[PDB]
Amino acid sequence: RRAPFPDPNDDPFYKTPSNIGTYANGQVIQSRKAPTDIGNQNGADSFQLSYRTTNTQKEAQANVATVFIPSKPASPPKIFSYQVYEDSTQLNCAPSYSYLTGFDEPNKVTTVLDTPIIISWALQQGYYVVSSDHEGPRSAFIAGYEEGMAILDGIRAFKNFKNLPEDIGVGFYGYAGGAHATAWAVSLAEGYAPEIKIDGAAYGGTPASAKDTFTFLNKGFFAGFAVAGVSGLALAHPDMEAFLEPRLNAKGKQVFEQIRSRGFCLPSVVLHNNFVDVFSLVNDTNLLIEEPIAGILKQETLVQAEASYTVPVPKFPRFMWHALPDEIVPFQPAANYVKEQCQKGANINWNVYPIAEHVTAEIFGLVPGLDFLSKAFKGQTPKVACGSGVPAIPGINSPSTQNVLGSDLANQLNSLKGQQSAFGKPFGSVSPPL
Amino acid sequence: RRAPFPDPNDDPFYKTPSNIGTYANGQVIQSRKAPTDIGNQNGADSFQLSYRTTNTQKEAQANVATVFIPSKPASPPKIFSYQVYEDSTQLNCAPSYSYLTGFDEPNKVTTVLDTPIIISWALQQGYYVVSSDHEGPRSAFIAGYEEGMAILDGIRAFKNFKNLPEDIGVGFYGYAGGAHATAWAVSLAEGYAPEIKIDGAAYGGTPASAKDTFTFLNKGFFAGFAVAGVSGLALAHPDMEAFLEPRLNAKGKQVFEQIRSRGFCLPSVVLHNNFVDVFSLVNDTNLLIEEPIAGILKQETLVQAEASYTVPVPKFPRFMWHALPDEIVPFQPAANYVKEQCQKGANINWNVYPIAEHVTAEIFGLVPGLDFLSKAFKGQTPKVACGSGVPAIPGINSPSTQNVLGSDLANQLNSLKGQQSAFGKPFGSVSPPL
Ligand SMILES: *[C@@H]1O[C@H](CO)[C@@H](O[C@@H]2O[C@H](CO)[C@@H](O)[C@H](O)[C@H]2NC(C)=O)[C@H](O)[C@H]1NC(C)=O
Numbered sequence: 001r002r003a004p005f006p007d008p009n010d011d012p013f014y015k016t017p018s019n020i021g022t023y024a025n026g027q028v029i030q031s032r033k034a035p036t037d038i039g040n041q042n043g044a045d046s047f048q049l050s051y052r053t054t055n056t057q058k059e060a061q062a063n064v065a066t067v068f069i070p071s072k073p074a075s076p077p078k079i080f081s082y083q084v085y086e087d088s089t090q091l092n093c094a095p096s097y098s099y100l101t102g103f104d105e106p107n108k109v110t111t112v113l114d115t116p117i118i119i120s121w122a123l124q125q126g127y128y129v130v131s132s133d134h135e136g137p138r139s140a141f142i143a144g145y146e147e148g149m150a151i152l153d154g155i156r157a158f159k160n161f162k163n164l165p166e167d168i169g170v171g172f173y174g175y176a177g178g179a180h181a182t183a184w185a186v187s188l189a190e191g192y193a194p195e196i197k198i199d200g201a202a203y204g205g206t207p208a209s210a211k212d213t214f215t216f217l218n219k220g221f222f223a224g225f226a227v228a229g230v231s232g233l234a235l236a237h238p239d240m241e242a243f244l245e246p247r248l249n250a251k252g253k254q255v256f257e258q259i260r261s262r263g264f265c266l267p268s269v270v271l272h273n274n275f276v277d278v279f280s281l282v283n284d285t286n287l288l289i290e291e292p293i294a295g296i297l298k299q300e301t302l303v304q305a306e307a308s309y310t311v312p313v314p315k316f317p318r319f320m321w322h323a324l325p326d327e328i329v330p331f332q333p334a335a336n337y338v339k340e341q342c343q344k345g346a347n348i349n350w351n352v353y354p355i356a357e358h359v360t361a362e363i364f365g366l367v368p369g370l371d372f373l374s375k376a377f378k379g380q381t382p383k384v385a386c387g388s389g390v391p392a393i394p395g396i397n398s399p400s401t402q403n404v405l406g407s408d409l410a411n412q413l414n415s416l417k418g419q420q421s422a423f424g425k426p427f428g429s430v431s432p433p434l
Numbered sequence: 435r436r437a438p439f440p441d442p443n444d445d446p447f448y449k450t451p452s453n454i455g456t457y458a459n460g461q462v463i464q465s466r467k468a469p470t471d472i473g474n475q476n477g478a479d480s481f482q483l484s485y486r487t488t489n490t491q492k493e494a495q496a497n498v499a500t501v502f503i504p505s506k507p508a509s510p511p512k513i514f515s516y517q518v519y520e521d522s523t524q525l526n527c528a529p530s531y532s533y534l535t536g537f538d539e540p541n542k543v544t545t546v547l548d549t550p551i552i553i554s555w556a557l558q559q560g561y562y563v564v565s566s567d568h569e570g571p572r573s574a575f576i577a578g579y580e581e582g583m584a585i586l587d588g589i590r591a592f593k594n595f596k597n598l599p600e601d602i603g604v605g606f607y608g609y610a611g612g613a614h615a616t617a618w619a620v621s622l623a624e625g626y627a628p629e630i631k632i633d634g635a636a637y638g639g640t641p642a643s644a645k646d647t648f649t650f651l652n653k654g655f656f657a658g659f660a661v662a663g664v665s666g667l668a669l670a671h672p673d674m675e676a677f678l679e680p681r682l683n684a685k686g687k688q689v690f691e692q693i694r695s696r697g698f699c700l701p702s703v704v705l706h707n708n709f710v711d712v713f714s715l716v717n718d719t720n721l722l723i724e725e726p727i728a729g730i731l732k733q734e735t736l737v738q739a740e741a742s743y744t745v746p747v748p749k750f751p752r753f754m755w756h757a758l759p760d761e762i763v764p765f766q767p768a769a770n771y772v773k774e775q776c777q778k779g780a781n782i783n784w785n786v787y788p789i790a791e792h793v794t795a796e797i798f799g800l801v802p803g804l805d806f807l808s809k810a811f812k813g814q815t816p817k818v819a820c821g822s823g824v825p826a827i828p829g830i831n832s833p834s835t836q837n838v839l840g841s842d843l844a845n846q847l848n849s850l851k852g853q854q855s856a857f858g859k860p861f862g863s864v865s866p867p868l
Pocket residue numbers: 243246247283284285
């Protein structure tokens with residue numbers, strides 16, 4: 001069975017009406033039921049929402065998000081916002097289209113692997129689920145402001161549409177390209193959507209800096225992502241599009257046309273431009289140094305050491321993970337982001353997998369991150385030193401005192417509780433406070 | 435019942451013979467059985483060993499260590515070196531004396547609280563136990579070279595005395611002042627005792643920098659430790675003793691006399707000089723700036739950013755912990771040490787307790803650290819990114835996939851193993867490699 005809906009390029013549902021400027025951010029333009037594999041597998045209604053959002057230039061535009069409605073909602077109610085690693089600069093790769101039933105949707109890989117297990121879990125807990133087309137109508141992959149505002153306005157639209165309490169607690173999940181959009185949504189939340197109440201966010205494989213991810217990727221096997229990211233920023237930064245187009249050589253012109261063309265989604269992106277140099281595509285090898293790109297890159301980062309703006313520092317419980325030898329998305333800018341955030345007051349539970357890559361870490365931290373989000377929805381995330389994980393605690397995340405010490409010495413140790421230590425302050429228990 | 439042995443000050447066993455220069459480092463000068471509470475409680479023989487070591491000026495001197503001999507040794511055999519937080523600059527506070535039976539030993543608090551539970555565990559696993567008088571005959575508290583060489587030569591003496599295989603695996607434990615001596619022993623091991631085979635070390639509450647610990651402590655409730663540390667360095671640095679003595683005022687002269695006097699051990703040290711300023715004791719407020727102390731402090735640190743020498747970087751499995759709000763021993767120099775070591779190739783499993791103090795963290799990380807040392811003796815310490823702990827892993831240190839996801843979604847997730855991810859590389863399992 002083929003997609004139940006027209007190609008988004010051919011569907012007026014995705015067009016931005018001329019009166020768009022008169023809708024408020026988050027206001028619903030229209031809605032429609034949407035046949036989705038996930039909605040079917042959980043007996044949950046699914047819908048598409050057209051709604052107004054704001055692009056990088058601060059101009060109104062219309063966008064689509066997908067909402068799943070759990071059969072038995074949890075009380076009090078929660079919204080779970082799942083961010084897809086769309087990783088494409090073509091409109092028919094969007095999450096909404098890829099959630100539909102059928103077999104031929106070109107980016108279906110981004111919604112049928114771990115995505116359904118993750119969105120199912122949230123629905124089986126009673127959470128309301130939104131997943132926006134975070135790249136927006138301009139398909140602007142890794143454009144942080146574009147993704148951020150679109151995700152948050154997607155949540156406002158979910159709240160407007162199902163008339164949910166203005167203070168419903170929201171939680172975010174995303175990996176890889178989904179983690180970039182997630183990271184920017186929570187970064188922008190305070191400044192752009194202060195009325196959204198965020199209980200928690202779990203994200204991993206995070207591209208913290210657009211510039212550092214480009215350098216890490218260029219000339220490598222996954223250089224096709226560097227092409228994709230250049231295409232995406234240019235679609236959200238028309239001054240960079242204007243700077244790039246006259247610099248594209250004969251080959252470069254055809255490369256970007258291919259990466260913006262219908263059906264060229266994530267599976268295509270990683271099967272093309274392997275080992276290519278983006279600089280080979282353009283006459284200028286000085287593009288990173290010259291304006292406007294040099295300034296844009298200073299905007300398109302969350303690392304304060306590179307940013308030309310004061311980076312926001314979200315305070316709610318956060319859970320982040322990353323493969324140390326990640327071969328697609330570099331570990332160190334994510335580590336630098338975590339450190340910076342922590343020195344300014346963040347609550348980041350940081351999880352570094354030593355023997356992992358981008359793909360294996362996508363699963364490794366999946367279950368802990370959802371567990372963490374379940375606790376965040378209950379206001380019960382564990383206490384951690386920011387930028388670390390929970391330390392070793394007998395009976396909780398490491399062997400019991402009995403298992404390690406045996407019964408006698410475990411009773412001796414237990415009975416030091418309350419007795420004077422050599423430092424004149426009393427001993428505590430083997431377990432830190434819960 | 436009073437101590438079975440004379441006061442160390444009155445016992446020729448502790449004196450350094452005139453022929454000391456003809457003994458090699460680690461060579462046993464003499465031995466004797468020693469009645470110890472710990473040795474009694476485990477049915478294990480205990481002995482004292484007199485043995486040659488090297489002081490900070492590179493001069494031979496004699497020292498005492500205490501060895502416990504498990505009834506049924508483990509095979510292959512291991513040595514467990516336990517470092518005591520003696521925290522005194524008086525000879526009758528030494529660990530050896532405090533291990534003896536009786537009630538009046540003045541530093542007995544340093545050997546009857548967690549110390550017996552820790553040394554018992556090692557004996558019940560079949561490990562050979564040494565605990566040196568790491569401060570040496572000059573009672574030089576937090577003098578790192580003095581403590582390091584004394585601990586390692588104590589191990590050589592244990593090996594010489596019980597004729598143990600030259601490649602017996604050694605493991606180290608220590609907290610607080612014990613962690614400082616431990617930290618310096620492993621730092622010096624390669625350069626000074628390359629023939630010692632180290633399987634692992636677990637230490638916490640570590641004073642990394644003598645200078646930073648002084649500043650952190652001075653004028654606070656525990657300023658008495660700052661007095662003690664000044665006394666200890668001066669006892670291992672005679673040029674600093676010569677600089678200090680003519681600067682001691684009428685009060686200062688009596689303060690240091692009290693802190694060097696018989697029976698003035700850890701319980702006294704924390705009951706005296708509360709809120710005192712060390713600068714008030716001396717005419718000169720410029721002592722940290724002036725020589726020789728300024729240079730000595732640059733030697734008496736493990737933080738490369740302060741050191742005037744290339745700090746060693748041990749490579750064997752290490753486990754370190756620290757209370758983030760530690761009020762006696764500052765967290766940040768220990769964190770800086772860990773970071774520096776990690777950037778140069780260390781294997782440090784780093785554990786930061788967020789809701790803890792110096793005393794509570796003394797227990798919190800006790801059981802994990804001994805567990806870690808059991809694994810290190812088996813060559814089975816877990817893999818960690820250096821400077822972090824093991825990240826969250828379902829079924830191992832966090833809830834099971836079944837517990838978090840339920841049975842269905844846990845089977846869906848499990849069955850992604852081996853299937854292509856959206857990135858064209860296959861998925862792995864929920865559990866990282868063991
Ligand atoms: C590569 O092509 C670009 C695209 O035109 C060239 O850009 C122009 O350079 C001239 C001379 O410096 C300027 O007056 C124009 O304004 C530029 N046009 C722009 C901004 O697109 C460029 O000279 C060529 N060479 C390199 C290495 O960049």
